[PDB]
């Protein structure tokens, strides 16, 4: 099945998932000089105070911190969004080296990693129905650079040893995603897709301009994870990022002047 290796990586996905060569695929390079300030954008609202995390899972591609989305708790609204989007999970994409790892790039610059906080449009009832709609999902993307440690990420880092291989999960309650956000909410937004198969084009991307810094030690632990399952040859979970795709007929809007 699909992965990030030479024989099943991004360049191969289109065979099982034709939409890989679609009209609004993600990620894309964000050309900052071509992005235009949009005064029609309303202020962005990230309300994560009532967030209820449940567990963490190694799915063989990345690790997902899942949340209880059966109620109106952690929601994203405002900005380019119409309505309320509910947080269902977050995960990261990272590299084997600090010089690569992010999916979106800024003026071709690659960051060490990228955090994706996934939300679904409540007007559609649930995540499954949402992914059949062009405005069913909203993903808040945050870049990670290596520098000072991020205190709010350490709880995630310390539980990774317990979910080293594909299929493993661990209880992960009371984790506050507010500790992963940078100070500024300035962002770029464009219509795109999931960056992993099935690559569905149901996403409104909101990529924050300000990256958060994490320590070399923190990202090093991300790289100790495994793509393989327990009892299988070890294949380090690194470089699980899809490269920038053609922007095609799209414009990236900026929330700032
Ligand atoms: O960011 C994602 N993949 O990398 C993603 C986004 C929405 C739903 C599932 C996955
Ligand atoms: Zn992602």
Please state, in angstroms and rounded to a whole number, the distance separating the CA atoms of residues 101 and 113: 5
Give the count of beta carbons closer than 10 Å to the beta carbon of residue 197. Answer: 18
Kindly list the domain boundaries of the chain, sorted by start residue.
1-257
The conformational region for residue 101 under phi > 0 = left, psi -120 to 50 = alpha, else beta, is: left
CB 204 within 8 A of CB 81: yes
CB 88 within 8 A of CB 69: yes
1 is in an annotated binding site: no
Closest ligand by atom to 203 CA: 1
Stated in angstroms to one decimal place, the resolution of this structure is: 1.9
Experimental method: X-ray
* Cα torsion through 122, 128, 131, 132, rounded to 10: -100
Q: Does domain 1-257 have CATH number 3.40.50.300?
A: no
Which residues contact residue 89 at a Cβ distance below 8 angstroms, ignoring those fewer than 6 apart?
Answer: 64, 65, 66, 67, 118
Which residues contact residue 33 at a Cβ distance below 8 angstroms, ignoring those fewer than 6 apart?
Answer: 107
Q: Which residues line ligand 1 (CB under 6 A)?
A: 116, 118, 137, 139, 194-196
């Amino acid at each position: 099945h699909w992965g990030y290796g030479k024989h099943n990586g991004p360049e191969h996905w289109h065979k099982d998932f034709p939409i890989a060569k679609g009209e609004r695929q993600s990620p894309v390079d964000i050309d900052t000089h071509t992005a235009k300030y949009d005064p029609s954008l309303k202020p962005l609202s990230v309300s994560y105070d009532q967030a209820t995390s449940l567990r963490i899972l190694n799915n063989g591609h990345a690790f997902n911190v899942e949340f209880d989305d059966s109620q109106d708790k952690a929601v994203l609204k405002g900005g380019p969004l119409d309505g309320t989007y509910r947080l269902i999970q977050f995960h990261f994409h990272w590299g084997s080296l600090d010089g690569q790892g992010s999916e979106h790039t800024v003026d071709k610059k690659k960051y060490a990693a990228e955090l994706h906080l996934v939300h679904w449009n409540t007007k559609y009832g649930d995540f499954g129905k949402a992914v059949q709609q062009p405005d069913g999902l909203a993903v808040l993307g945050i870049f990670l650079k290596v520098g000072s440690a991020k205190p709010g990420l350490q709880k995630v880092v310390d539980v990774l040893d317990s979910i080293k291989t594909k299929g493993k999960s661990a209880d992960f309650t009371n984790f506050d995603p507010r500790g992963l956000l940078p100070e500024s909410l300035d962002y770029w937004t464009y219509p795109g897709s999931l960056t992993t198969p099935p690559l569905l084009e149901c996403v409104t991307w909101i990529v924050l301009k300000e990256p958060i810094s994490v320590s070399s030690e923190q990202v090093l632990k991300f790289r100790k994870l495994n793509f393989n399952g327990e009892g299988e040859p070890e294949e380090l979970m690194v470089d699980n990022w899809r490269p920038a795709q053609p922007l095609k007929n799209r414009q990236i809007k900026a929330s700032f002047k």
